[PDB]
Amino acid sequence: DPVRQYLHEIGQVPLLTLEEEIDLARKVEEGMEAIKKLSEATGLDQELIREVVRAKILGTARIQKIPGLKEKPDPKTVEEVDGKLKSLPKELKRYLHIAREGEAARQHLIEANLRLVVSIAKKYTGRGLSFLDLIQEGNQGLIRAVEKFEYKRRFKFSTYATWWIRQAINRAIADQARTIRIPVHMVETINKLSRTARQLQQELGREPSYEEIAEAMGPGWDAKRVEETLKIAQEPVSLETPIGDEKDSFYGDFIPDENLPSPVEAAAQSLLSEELEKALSKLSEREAMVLKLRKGLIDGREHTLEEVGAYFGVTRERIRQIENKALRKLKYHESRTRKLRDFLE
Amino acid sequence: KARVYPFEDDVEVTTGDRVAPGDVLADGGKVKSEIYGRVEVDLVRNVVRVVESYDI
DNA sequence: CTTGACAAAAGTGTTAAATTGTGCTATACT
């Protein structure tokens, strides 16, 4: 059981007393301001030196080689900035150390409040997303809450954290739970719809109609709109969904293929092309060529008027008269043979 | 569990890396760690701590 | 086979509406 594993793993790392909390926050902010001061030192960006320090902290070679096969070279752009930051006087140096310690503090803080996140994610199940996924989204929301936190406001970090964890988990339901992608706006919309529907179903004693629920939704809401949003809200169906009491049948294998031509269809198209080819041959050579230039029987494209006139060297009007005439001659011979009178669907 | 090494002038080593007995600690070769272990540079006490562990 | 005159159809470039993606909130809460 993975849940047991992770829960025990975070059960290992203890909580944090107010002293520890405030001290860690302090050390973090000191670290960041140290990074900024180092940005005024060597003249490089904050996140640059930050990610370098991380690369010296949360693992040696493992931060670089696998966030995908290509990021920032190990011996080259990492180590040269490292050595460049190495070559500074005493104050900037002590600030380097301070920065590193800040990073570590950030990590620990993150852990205790991972326990917190686990509580919050424990609140949110039923999703359309699994428990551990909830935990992890909440954990990212936790790293996020840690980054922007300010201890000077003298508030317990737990509250600020909770808000961020919650919003992160909601970002999960919005971005995940449904097989098809439904963006945030209509997710919230659907939620409001269902909520209100529940409310007036409680009131009226029965399910509503699109009209009354639309009116209960306020302005801009009609029957068609709630019907449409409800049409989007519905989920796909599993192809493996069992049909009947039989164990030999699925739902998906009862689905026909209209994308693929049936033998009768291929034969139909064949006979059409052939019979049309033979019914074409009784025309004059030029008019037939013109026709099959118009139809796409040559390159598949449609050569207009002027194009045909350009290829045969004549005017476009002549081409027009030509094709009309062809059409009527085919009218005669087809009025006779009745071979092509079909294919009329 | 550790061995303490107070310094004076800056430091060569940084928090978290690896040192072997005889390797150079702070003050330009003034103090060396005689023991295998991870090294932590402490600002407040102005000291270099070597906690014995193997880099494994 | 030809030409010129015309509108309907299909194009082409700037704008408005709605659409979607991203971030944020501080009693405390593990």
Q: What's the CA gap between B50 and A263, in Å, rounded?
A: 81
CA angle A159, A163, A166 (to 5 degrees): 130
For A293, how many CA atoms within 13 A lie in the half-sphere containing its CB? 20
Domains of chain A plus CATH, in order, are 1-178 (1.20.120.1810), 182-235 (1.10.10.10), 261-341 (1.10.10.10)
Please report residues of A whose CB lies closer than 8 A to that of B41: 97
First to last CA, chain A: 61
What are residue A343's phi and psi, to 5 degrees?
Answer: 65, 25
For A272, how many CA atoms within 13 A lie in the half-sphere containing its CB? 11
Q: Which of A243, A241, A214 is nearest to A227 (CA)?
A: A214
Please report residues of B whose CB lies closer than 8 A to that of A105: none
Please report residues of B whose CB lies closer than 8 A to that of A94: 43
| Stretch (H or E) spanning B18 | strand B18-19
Q: In a 3-state reduction of DSSP, which class is residue B39?
A: strand
Q: In a 3-state reduction of DSSP, which class is residue A3?
A: helix
A107-136 residues near strand C (Cβ < 7 Å): 112-113, 115-116, 118-119
| Residue count of chain B | 56
Q: In a 3-state reduction of DSSP, which class is residue A106?
A: helix
What are residue B39's phi and psi, to 5 degrees?
Answer: -115, 130
Please report residues of B whose CB lies closer than 8 A to that of A100: 14-16
Q: What's the CA gap between A139 and A166, in Å, rounded?
A: 10
Q: Resolution of the coordinates in A?
A: 4.0
Q: Please give the structure tokens belonging to residue A223.
A: 């029957």
Cβ–Cβ under 8 Å, residues B53 and B16 = no
Q: Tokens 């005493």 identify what position?
A: A90
Q: Quick check: A22 CB within 7 A of strand C?
A: no
Cβ–Cβ under 8 Å, residues B48 and B25 = yes
Q: Quick one: CA dihedral A59, A47, A172, A124, positive or negative? A: positive
Residue B39 near chain A (CB below 8 Å)? no
Q: In a 3-state reduction of DSSP, which class is residue B42?
A: strand
Q: In a 3-state reduction of DSSP, which class is residue B32?
A: strand
Q: What's the CA gap between B49 and B56, in Å, rounded?
A: 19
CA of A344 to C1' of C22 (A): 55
Cβ–Cβ under 8 Å, residues A229 and A239 = no
Helix intervals (H) in chain A: 2-12, 18-41, 46-57, 62-65, 79-86, 90-123, 131-148, 157-175, 184-204, 210-216, 223-233, 263-280, 285-295, 305-312, 316-337
Asked if A97 and B43 come within 8 Å (Cβ–Cβ), the reply is yes
Q: What's the CA gap between A343 and A7, in Å, rounded?
A: 69
CA angle A75, A80, A83 (to 5 degrees): 120
What are residue A129's phi and psi, to 5 degrees?
Answer: -145, 145
- Facing residue for A100 by CB, picked from B10, B11, B15: B15
Residue A262 DSSP symbol: P
Count of Cβ atoms closer than 10 Å to residue A115 Cβ: 15
Question: Which of chain C's bases lie under 7 Å from a protein CB?
Answer: 1-4, 19-30
Residue B22 near chain A (CB below 8 Å)? no
Q: Quick one: CA dihedral A283, A284, A285, A290, positive or negative? A: negative
Q: What's the CA gap between A31 and A161, in Å, rounded?
A: 20
- The technique by which this structure was obtained is X-ray
Asked if B10 and A56 come within 8 Å (Cβ–Cβ), the reply is no
Residue B41 near chain A (CB below 8 Å)? yes
Q: Tokens 């009862």 identify what position?
A: A254
| Residue count of chain A | 345
- Integer CA distances (angstroms), A256 to A25, A239, A252, A262, B47, in order: 62, 13, 9, 11, 77
Distant-in-sequence, close-in-space partners of A239: CB < 8 Å, separation ≥ 6? A250, A251, A252, A255
Q: Quick check: A42 CB within 7 A of strand C?
A: no
Cβ–Cβ under 8 Å, residues A120 and A166 = yes
Distant-in-sequence, close-in-space partners of B6: CB < 8 Å, separation ≥ 6? B31, B45, B46, B47, B48
Q: Please give the structure tokens belonging to residue A34.
A: 């140290």
Long-range residue pairs from A254-263, CB within 8 A, at least 24 positions apart, any chain: none
Q: Quick one: CA dihedral A6, A11, A14, A15, positive or negative? A: positive
